[PDB]
Amino acid sequence: NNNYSKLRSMGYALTGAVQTLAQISDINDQNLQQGIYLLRDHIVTLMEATLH
Amino acid sequence: NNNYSKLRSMGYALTGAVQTLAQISDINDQNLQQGIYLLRDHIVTLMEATLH
């Protein structure tokens, strides 16, 4: 119950949240980019044949 | 003006920012996903008719 101790403990928790939030943000952004790339590739493949 | 008090007050502010940032990130990601889904649905609907 030291005045510094229950502050050090909260300092421990106040950084894993930031780290995990960054990780989830990166995962979401990468998934969105991959989906967009797959969609554009399929669209181009479909688009060539009708022109020909 | 207690040495712990003006630290507790800053600890108060140093978490709502993280919470709101997470909320805004989720909102943006969901909006992007919904837009992509709407675009792909419309593209598929347009794509079937020209093939037929």
């Binding site: 229950k6 928790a13 106040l14 | 600890g11 993280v18």
Partner: peptide
């Protein structure tokens, strides 16, 4: 959410 809640719990005492 639990981490932020514990952060807010580690200050009311």
């Amino acid at each position: 959410k639990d981490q932020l809640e514990r952060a807010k719990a580690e200050l009311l005492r």
